[PDB]
C-alpha cells in the first residue's frame, strides 16, 4: 500500500489518516497526529526531541 512519511516524527502514515498543513511558502507538511502538529506549531526542532526518527538517525541509534 501507499504509505506516507510524517515530517516531524519521520514515521510512516497509513491511508486514511494524517494532517497535512500547507504552509504559505507553498510547501506541504504532513503531520502524523495531534502531538507532532502541536510541537511543530510551537516551533520545536524535531532533531532535538528524543523520540523522533530524525533525532535517532542523526545520532545513529
Amino acid at each position: 500500500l501507499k504509505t506516507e512519511l510524517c515530517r516531524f516524527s519521520g514515521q510512516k502514515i497509513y491511508p486514511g489518516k494524517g494532517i497535512r498543513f500547507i504552509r504559505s511558502d507553498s510547501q506541504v507538511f504532513l503531520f502524523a497526529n495531534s502531538k507532532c502538529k502541536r510541537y511543530f506549531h510551537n516551533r520545536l526542532k524535531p532533531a532535538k526531541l528524543c523520540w523522533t526518527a530524525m533525532y535517532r538517525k542523526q545520532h545513529k541509534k
Binding site: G16, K17, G18, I22, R23, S24, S26
Partner: protein, 129 residues
Amino acid sequence: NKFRMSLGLPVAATVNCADNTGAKNLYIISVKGIKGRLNRLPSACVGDMVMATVKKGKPDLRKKVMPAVIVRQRKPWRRKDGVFMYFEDNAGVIVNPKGEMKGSAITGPIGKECADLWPRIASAANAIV
C-alpha cells in the same frame, strides 16, 4: 459537484487579499447561495463566493462590496481522501460576478477545491495544492 467541507469564515471575518489587484485585505459580509436559520451567521469555506468590502487597500477599491472567492482557510477540513488538510492564513481573491479573476495572479497556493471549482482562479494560481 463539490462536496461539503468545514465552514470556517463567518461574516465580519477579515481575510488576506491574495492577488495583484492592490487590495490588501477583504472583509466578509455575506455568502452566495446560503439560506439562513435564526441567529446563524453565514459562513464561507474554500471555494465559496462571498461579498466583501476592502478595509485596508488601494483607495479606488474601497467603499463598495465586491464578489470575492475564498482560496485559503485555516480551519482544518476532512478531504474525501481522509486527510485533514488546511493552510496557514485566511485568504481570498477578488472576482467578478461571472467568476472571472479581476486581477492577474494569485500569490501562493490556493485550495484544490477552489481552483477546480473556479475555472479561472485555477489558471491565475501558480501552484495548486
